[PDB]
Design a protein around this nucleic acid. Structure first.
Ligand code: MG
Ligand code: MG
Ligand code: MG
Ligand code: MG
Ligand code: MG
Ligand code: MG
Ligand code: MG
Ligand code: MG
Ligand code: MG
Ligand code: MG
Ligand code: MG
Ligand code: MG
Ligand code: MG
Ligand code: MG
Ligand code: MG
Ligand code: MG
Ligand code: MG
Ligand code: MG
Ligand code: MG
Ligand code: MG
Ligand code: MG
Ligand code: MG
Ligand code: MG
Ligand code: MG
Ligand code: MG
Ligand code: MG
Ligand code: MG
Ligand code: MG
Ligand code: MG
Ligand code: MG
Ligand code: MG
Ligand code: MG
Ligand code: MG
Ligand code: MG
Ligand code: MG
Ligand code: MG
Ligand code: MG
Ligand code: MG
Ligand code: MG
Ligand code: MG
Ligand code: MG
Ligand code: MG
Ligand code: MG
Ligand code: MG
Ligand code: MG
Ligand code: MG
Ligand code: MG
Ligand code: MG
Ligand code: ZN
Lengths: 181, 23, 69, 116, 83
RNA sequence: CGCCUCCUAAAAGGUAACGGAGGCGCCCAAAGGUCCCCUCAGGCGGGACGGAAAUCCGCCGGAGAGCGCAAGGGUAGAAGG
RNA sequence: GGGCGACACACGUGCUACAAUGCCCACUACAAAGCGAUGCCACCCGGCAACGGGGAGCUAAUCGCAAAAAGGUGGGCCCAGUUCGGAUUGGGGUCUGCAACCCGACCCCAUGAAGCCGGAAUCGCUAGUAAUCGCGGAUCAGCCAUGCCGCGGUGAAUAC
RNA sequence: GCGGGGUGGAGCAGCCUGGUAGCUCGUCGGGCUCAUAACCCGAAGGUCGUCGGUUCAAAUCCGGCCCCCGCAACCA
């Protein structure tokens, strides 16, 4: 399988330093990444122009993986929502494609972000997972100003094998996540 | 323009000078 | 993976404006960025860009000590 | 976005485009194009990726712009409002600040007329 | 503003009261008619009663509010709105 | 005024009153046959626009969800998707 | 010392505009009436600039205010809420004055709002007029003058 | 006891057929007038009597209570 920088860096620098700080007695005890799930709760495409192949074409370029649909679980009056209506996209990244995405995310995306002052320290699950939001998909390198019709950001969920926020915090900072406080 | 101080026509209006109307 | 629904991954060349080049994989073989991890203000320690201000106000006026005592 | 954090209008002369940035006016435009030796007349679409990064690097490094500019000015009023200055109460009651009559006009600070 | 080449204005008589108290250690009350004055670094922590035309308004000065005039802290008008 | 559900009904079945409460006079070409796979409501925590509530991640949750429509019975070891 | 400068609102008189018969920069023309000895201040220098330090002339057809401006030549903008428009505010300075918080003008950096030609209604002007352009004076330390009293430049349409 | 009804300030629509509150007058701000009326131009205000339920959503469909109009209350 693929040799990439972050995947390599995890085993080489992140792994040992982690075993240092928390002193695990088993290799599998030490924090790992399981999956990063990307989401676009969209729903602007509820009725209107429920043609969002433009964003599925977007997310497919960002992650090299075809997103799946999300549809309404229940109908909602105030939101103008028929049950089963197509209102969002979700792609689940594991293994190599997970690293490659995070790799470009940490090295490129967060920098290009408007007035970036560091990731939110407090967006930590409690069970050692992490979630963050994006206002724009232009934040990535593979999406030029030209090929976009409208601003559409996303939800980003990263799951760890950790049990506490503290091991999770360390695993992620050691990988290269920039926290403000 | 005549209300816009940062122009030639503008400072003639006020009857003052500066970088945007030199003497 | 399924075939015919997936954009294809290839070795990629992300270039920054500091002249950082990043070795990775992508759907596009060559990309240029405006900024990166290697040069960003918040990123590089605490390179406080245009303002190492310390305010400066408000004790800072000090013009001067010439009022009398 | 190109410079700085915003993507200045391509198809305009490089000097005008720059003013489409919060924090850079006509003066600061010719001023950035002096200290970089870039032709004030050329269309933005016709910058070298070299000319780009040079023009880029000066502007971003000399002046506070877009986000942080707004941020300080914000904090500047924030404090003025919070010390209880006269200029503070005027911001906190939303009225004008610079010795204008309020009995008429004053609309730009006040907003559309709340008739009675 | 007050022309930078000249001075930073404080009414002579009030400056002295601050400085007298500085020696002794501050602070009593300071009934004043000195709106034309500048708040000045020696004044921090004192409690000054400024005349707004009507009352003597108690203003605790801080390290943040220095370069201003005194009267900016004694409002001349009472306004609660209309209707 | 016919039909269905519950109670009255006295632990088989049945049981009256101008006793107490509600529903039906339809519907579905899939909401049917079968093979294969899947598990809910809700609570806490986390997440751009995003709200009490859209979609996303985690942990707890035997059924309090769902089963077109009244009610009862049944039911996730499916009759639910 | 404060108020006459307030501000949920309504009206009168105005200023500047919404732009290409226009906006902007450079160079370049042609007025008049006035005004001026702790007054106007040529010119030189420091300053992006307001201004500041020098310093000559003039009781003024002599010297100064002084450039008139629309205009002319050239160049840029290219129909866009814009190189239109310049309100609102942030930051920094000059000056007058004992003193510019309430509550002055001006200069500079940044901010760049409303406004795409105006509902019912309604005003002025018959020719060197209307429209448009600049200049001065009184009051006056400075100035909230876009007001007022004058002065010239360009210069119509129409009255059956 | 049977049928109908409650919606800006007044008086009526919309309810049957669930998603969208309308008409005349009146009120308020402007205009014409010396002034008022009329007339002309703009503009506010009903969360639909309540509490409950059905629904994805109720002025609208279903129940409760409240108040109003009409009719009935006969052989005795
Ligand atoms: Mg946390
Ligand atoms: Mg991008
Ligand atoms: Mg975990
Ligand atoms: Mg302009
Ligand atoms: Mg004009
Ligand atoms: Mg700008
Ligand atoms: Mg005022
Ligand atoms: Mg029958
Ligand atoms: Mg029985
Ligand atoms: Mg029984
Ligand atoms: Mg029985
Ligand atoms: Mg039997
Ligand atoms: Mg089927
Ligand atoms: Mg079935
Ligand atoms: Mg089937
Ligand atoms: Mg749940
Ligand atoms: Mg939640
Ligand atoms: Mg939110
Ligand atoms: Mg939510
Ligand atoms: Mg059930
Ligand atoms: Mg008066
Ligand atoms: Mg008006
Ligand atoms: Mg006026
Ligand atoms: Mg007017
Ligand atoms: Mg605009
Ligand atoms: Mg003042
Ligand atoms: Mg402009
Ligand atoms: Mg507009
Ligand atoms: Mg236009
Ligand atoms: Mg016009
Ligand atoms: Mg007109
Ligand atoms: Mg008419
Ligand atoms: Mg006549
Ligand atoms: Mg005079
Ligand atoms: Mg004067
Ligand atoms: Mg004023
Ligand atoms: Mg004048
Ligand atoms: Mg009514
Ligand atoms: Mg009907
Ligand atoms: Mg209907
Ligand atoms: Mg009226
Ligand atoms: Mg009338
Ligand atoms: Mg429901
Ligand atoms: Mg409704
Ligand atoms: Mg209801
Ligand atoms: Mg309801
Ligand atoms: Mg009812
Ligand atoms: Mg009767
Ligand atoms: Zn870089």
């Amino acid at each position: 399988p693929l040799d990439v920088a972050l995947k390599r860096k995890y085993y080489e620098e992140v792994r040992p330093e982690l075993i240092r700080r928390f002193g695990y007695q088993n290799v599998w005890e030490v924090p790992r990444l399981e999956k990063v799930v990307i989401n676009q709760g969209l729903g602007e495409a509820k009725e209107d122009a429920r043609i969002l192949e433009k964003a599925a074409q977007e997310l497919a370029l960002i992650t090299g993986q075809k997103p799946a649909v999300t549809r309404a679980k229940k109908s909602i009056s105030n939101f103008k929502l028929r049950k089963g209506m197509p209102i969002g996209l979700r792609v689940t990244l594991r293994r190599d494609r997970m690293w490659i995405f995070l790799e470009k995310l940490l090295n490129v995306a967060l920098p290009r972000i408007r007035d970036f002052r560091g990731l939110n320290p407090n967006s930590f699950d409690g069970r050692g997972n992490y979630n963050l939001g994006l206002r724009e998909q232009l934040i990535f390198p593979e999406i030029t100003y030209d090929m976009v019709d409208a601003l559409r950001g996303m939800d980003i969920a990263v799951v760890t094998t950790a049990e506490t926020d503290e091991e999770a915090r360390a695993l992620l900072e050691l990988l290269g996540f920039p926290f403000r406080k | 323009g005549k209300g816009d101080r940062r122009t030639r026509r503008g400072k003639i209006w006020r009857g003052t000078y500066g970088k945007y109307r030199p003497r | 993976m399924k075939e015919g629904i997936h954009p294809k991954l290839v070795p990629a060349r992300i270039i920054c404006g500091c002249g950082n080049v990043i070795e990775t994989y992508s759907t596009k073989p060559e990309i240029y960025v405006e900024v990166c991890s290697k040069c960003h203000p918040f990123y590089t320690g605490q390179q406080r860009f245009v303002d190492t201000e310390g305010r400066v106000e408000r004790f800072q006026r000090r013009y001067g000590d010439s009022y009398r005592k | 976005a190109r410079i700085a954090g915003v993507e200045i209008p391509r198809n305009k002369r490089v000097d005008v485009a720059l003013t489409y940035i919060y924090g850079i006016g006509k003066a600061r435009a010719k001023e950035a194009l002096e200290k970089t030796g870039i032709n004030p007349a050329t269309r933005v679409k016709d910058l070298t990726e070299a000319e780009v990064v040079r023009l880029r690097e000066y502007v971003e490094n000399t002046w506070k712009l877009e986000g942080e500019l707004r941020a300080e000015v914000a904090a500047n009023i924030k404090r003025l409002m919070d010390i209880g200055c006269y200029r503070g109460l005027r911001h906190r009651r939303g009225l004008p600040v610079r010795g204008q009559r309020t009995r008429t006009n004053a609309r730009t600070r006040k907003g559309p007329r709340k008739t009675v | 503003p007050r022309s930078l080449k000249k001075g930073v204005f404080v009414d002579d008589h009030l400056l002295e009261k601050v400085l007298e108290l500085n020696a002794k250690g501050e602070k009593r009350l300071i009934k004043t008619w000195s709106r034309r004055s500048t708040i000045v670094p020696e004044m921090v922590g004192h409690t000054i009663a400024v005349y707004n035309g009507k009352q003597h308004v108690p203003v605790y000065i801080t390290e943040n509010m220095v370069g201003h005039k005194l009267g900016e802290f004694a409002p001349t008008r009472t306004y609660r709105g209309h209707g």
